[PDB]
Design an enzyme around this catalytic site. Structure first.
Site, PDB file in Angstrom:
ATOM      1  N   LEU A  19       0.848  -1.196   0.000  1.00 34.89           N
ATOM      2  CA  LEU A  19       0.000   0.000   0.000  1.00 34.89           C
ATOM      3  C   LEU A  19       0.881   1.243   0.000  1.00 34.89           C
ATOM      4  CD1 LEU A  19      -2.935  -0.838   2.498  1.00 34.89           C
ATOM      5  CD2 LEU A  19      -2.845  -1.162  -0.006  1.00 34.89           C
ATOM      6  N   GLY A  20       1.974   1.158   0.742  1.00 31.22           N
ATOM      7  CA  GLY A  20       2.960   2.214   0.855  1.00 31.22           C
ATOM      8  C   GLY A  20       4.213   1.759   1.561  1.00 31.22           C
ATOM      9  N   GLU A  21       5.251   2.563   1.397  1.00 31.67           N
ATOM     10  CA  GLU A  21       6.572   2.377   1.965  1.00 31.67           C
ATOM     11  C   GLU A  21       6.948   3.680   2.659  1.00 31.67           C
ATOM     12  OE1 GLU A  21       9.060   0.660  -1.065  1.00 31.67           O
ATOM     13  OE2 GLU A  21      10.144  -0.476   0.478  1.00 31.67           O
ATOM     14  N   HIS A  23       9.808   5.337   6.115  1.00 31.45           N
ATOM     15  CA  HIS A  23      11.041   5.420   6.896  1.00 31.45           C
ATOM     16  C   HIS A  23      11.359   4.007   7.444  1.00 31.45           C
ATOM     17  CE1 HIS A  23       8.535   8.982   6.998  1.00 31.45           C
ATOM     18  NE2 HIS A  23       9.600   9.767   7.190  1.00 31.45           N
ATOM     19  N   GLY A  25      10.180   1.270   6.980  1.00 35.29           N
ATOM     20  CA  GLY A  25       8.981   0.469   7.208  1.00 35.29           C
ATOM     21  C   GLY A  25       8.172   0.261   5.943  1.00 35.29           C
ATOM     22  N   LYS A  26       7.048  -0.478   6.044  1.00 34.55           N
ATOM     23  CA  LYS A  26       6.135  -0.678   4.920  1.00 34.55           C
ATOM     24  C   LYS A  26       4.764  -1.145   5.376  1.00 34.55           C
ATOM     25  CE  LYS A  26       7.423  -4.376   2.086  1.00 34.55           C
ATOM     26  NZ  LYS A  26       6.868  -5.191   0.977  1.00 34.55           N
ATOM     27  N   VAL A  27       3.722  -0.754   4.636  1.00 32.06           N
ATOM     28  CA  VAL A  27       2.333  -1.128   4.913  1.00 32.06           C
ATOM     29  C   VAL A  27       1.834  -1.950   3.736  1.00 32.06           C
ATOM     30  CG1 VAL A  27      -0.052  -0.282   5.314  1.00 32.06           C
ATOM     31  CG2 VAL A  27       1.862   0.681   6.601  1.00 32.06           C
ATOM     32  N   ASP A 138       4.032  13.995  11.156  1.00 30.64           N
ATOM     33  CA  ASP A 138       3.902  13.511   9.790  1.00 30.64           C
ATOM     34  C   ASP A 138       2.488  13.811   9.233  1.00 30.64           C
ATOM     35  OD1 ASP A 138       5.136  12.270   7.602  1.00 30.64           O
ATOM     36  OD2 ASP A 138       4.554  10.252   8.206  1.00 30.64           O
TER      37      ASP A 138
HETATM   38  C1  LIG Z   1      -6.335   0.793  -1.054  1.00 36.26           C
HETATM   39  O1  LIG Z   1      -6.377   1.709   0.071  1.00 36.26           O
HETATM   40  C2  LIG Z   1      -5.203   2.245   0.447  1.00 36.26           C
HETATM   41  N1  LIG Z   1      -4.385   2.892  -0.353  1.00 36.26           N
HETATM   42  N2  LIG Z   1      -3.395   3.343   0.449  1.00 36.26           N
HETATM   43  C3  LIG Z   1      -2.250   4.027  -0.135  1.00 36.26           C
HETATM   44  C4  LIG Z   1      -3.638   3.114   1.746  1.00 36.26           C
HETATM   45  C5  LIG Z   1      -4.810   2.416   1.834  1.00 36.26           C
HETATM   46  N3  LIG Z   1      -5.553   1.963   2.892  1.00 36.26           N
HETATM   47  C6  LIG Z   1      -5.091   1.852   4.191  1.00 36.26           C
HETATM   48  N4  LIG Z   1      -5.959   1.315   5.057  1.00 36.26           N
HETATM   49  C7  LIG Z   1      -5.546   1.270   6.322  1.00 36.26           C
HETATM   50  C8  LIG Z   1      -4.330   1.765   6.781  1.00 36.26           C
HETATM   51  C9  LIG Z   1      -3.993   1.729   8.249  1.00 36.26           C
HETATM   52  C10 LIG Z   1      -3.489   2.390   5.775  1.00 36.26           C
HETATM   53  C11 LIG Z   1      -2.139   2.880   6.019  1.00 36.26           C
HETATM   54  C12 LIG Z   1      -1.560   3.178   7.225  1.00 36.26           C
HETATM   55  N5  LIG Z   1      -0.270   3.594   7.049  1.00 36.26           N
HETATM   56  C13 LIG Z   1       0.044   3.532   5.713  1.00 36.26           C
HETATM   57  C14 LIG Z   1       1.235   3.851   5.048  1.00 36.26           C
HETATM   58  N6  LIG Z   1       2.331   4.371   5.766  1.00 36.26           N
HETATM   59  C15 LIG Z   1       3.661   4.300   5.488  1.00 36.26           C
HETATM   60  O2  LIG Z   1       4.127   3.703   4.525  1.00 36.26           O
HETATM   61  C16 LIG Z   1       4.559   4.969   6.476  1.00 36.26           C
HETATM   62  C17 LIG Z   1       4.311   6.303   6.826  1.00 36.26           C
HETATM   63  C18 LIG Z   1       5.099   6.911   7.790  1.00 36.26           C
HETATM   64  C19 LIG Z   1       6.100   6.172   8.382  1.00 36.26           C
HETATM   65  N7  LIG Z   1       6.386   4.902   8.043  1.00 36.26           N
HETATM   66  C20 LIG Z   1       5.638   4.296   7.111  1.00 36.26           C
HETATM   67  C21 LIG Z   1       5.999   2.868   6.825  1.00 36.26           C
HETATM   68  C22 LIG Z   1       1.236   3.758   3.655  1.00 36.26           C
HETATM   69  C23 LIG Z   1       0.123   3.298   2.965  1.00 36.26           C
HETATM   70  C24 LIG Z   1      -1.044   2.962   3.634  1.00 36.26           C
HETATM   71  C25 LIG Z   1      -1.104   3.102   5.019  1.00 36.26           C
HETATM   72  N8  LIG Z   1      -3.871   2.344   4.484  1.00 36.26           N
END
Ligand SMILES: COc1nn(C)cc1Nc1ncc(C)c(-c2c[nH]c3c(NC(=O)c4cccnc4C)cccc23)n1
Length: 288
Positions: A19-21, A23, A25-27, A138
């Site tokens: 979903l994202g990357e 610092h 980390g990654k989600v 952030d």
């Molecule tokens: C398809 O829906 C979707 N698109 N994106 C793009 C997201 C979502 N949905 C979603 N649902 C629940 C959640 C809880 C989230 C979500 C939470 N944190 C995310 C991050 N953070 C980082 O990568 C980050 C930021 C700061 C520090 N370190 C790190 C690793 C990226 C993308 C997503 C999320 N995202």
């Protein structure tokens, strides 16, 4: 012995896509599927990339922070997936993405009234965080997740730090990957983070919301036009210098001056001079 609803077994946690990357980390979008038939709940999963020890402690501190945050406009903690000596943060999945993905695709549905409603909900989640003595550090549209067309939630606490009882701010050491174009002058100049520093980052987030997260009018895109895009290592000091001269992001197109004036109040050079999240709420509800 009873089953813990916050304990997610690694074997039943199936990765779908990133979903994202961030610092170090990654989600990821994962499906927690204990029954193995693809009916299990979709969850957002934060973990660290294999390639720093101190980054594990930060994640554990982030998990503990989110576990105890309870607000309508704060993304819900679901649980953890342990290794231990390895951990994954399990959160609810918001399929509409952040404002960065949702706003360019939904401009027709989202008028000024709905933008001011999102601004209110961002301030409410932010004020709750602030009341618990945390600095977010952030606050950006990429971190404002879309629950529905009527609801937003602050969706990531990866840079969130506690302010000491005696202190007005928190001093940071891990500076490298700072979202500088969202940062207040004291953050750029002294590595000091006040609740008022989040109020400054809110002003920038609001600007993004009013511009429907258009890439060409993004805070980075606009600031680089002001200062210049080819300064490299000198970008942050040239950014400190323009903010010192009183230069701020311009008025989003179609944004009325009254909304812009509330945004400008987020951008008073001195942290003590900035509006609070509670005052912004009053100003937005008065316009609604
Ligand atoms: C398809 O829906 C979707 N698109 N994106 C793009 C997201 C979502 N949905 C979603 N649902 C629940 C959640 C809880 C989230 C979500 C939470 N944190 C995310 C991050 N953070 C980082 O990568 C980050 C930021 C700061 C520090 N370190 C790190 C690793 C990226 C993308 C997503 C999320 N995202």
């Amino acid at each position: 012995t009873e089953v813990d609803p916050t304990h997610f077994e690694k074997r039943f946690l199936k990765r779908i896509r990133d979903l994202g990357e961030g610092h170090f980390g990654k989600v990821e979008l994962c499906r927690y599927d204990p029954e193995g038939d693809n009916t299990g709940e979709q969850v957002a999963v934060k973990s660290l990339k294999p390639e720093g020890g101190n980054h594990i402690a930060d994640l554990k501190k982030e998990i503990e922070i989110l576990r105890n945050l309870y607000h309508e406009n704060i993304v819900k903690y679901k649980g953890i997936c342990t290794e231990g000596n390895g951990i994954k943060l399990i959160m609810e999945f918001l399929p509409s993405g952040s404002l960065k993905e949702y706003l360019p695709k939904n401009k027709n549905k989202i008028n000024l009234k709905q933008q001011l409603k999102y601004a209110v909900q961002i301030c409410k989640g932010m004020d709750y965080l602030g009341s618990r003595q945390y600095v977010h550090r952030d606050l950006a549209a990429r971190n404002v997740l879309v629950e529905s067309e009527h609801q937003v939630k602050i969706g990531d606490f990866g840079l969130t730090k506690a302010i000491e009882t005696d202190k007005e701010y928190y001093t940071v050491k891990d500076d490298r990957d700072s979202p500088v174009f969202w940062y207040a002058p004291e953050c750029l100049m002294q590595s000091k983070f006040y609740i008022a520093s989040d109020v400054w980052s809110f002003g920038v987030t609001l600007h993004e919301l009013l511009t429907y997260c258009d890439s060409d009018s993004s805070p980075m895109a606009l600031f680089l036009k002001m200062i210049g895009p080819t300064h490299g290592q000198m970008t942050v000091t040239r950014l400190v210098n323009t903010l010192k001269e009183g230069k701020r992001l311009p008025c989003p197109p179609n944004c009325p001056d009254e909304v812009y004036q509330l945004m400008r109040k987020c951008w008073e050079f001195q942290p003590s001079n900035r509006t609070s999240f509670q005052n912004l709420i009053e100003g937005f509800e008065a316009l609604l």
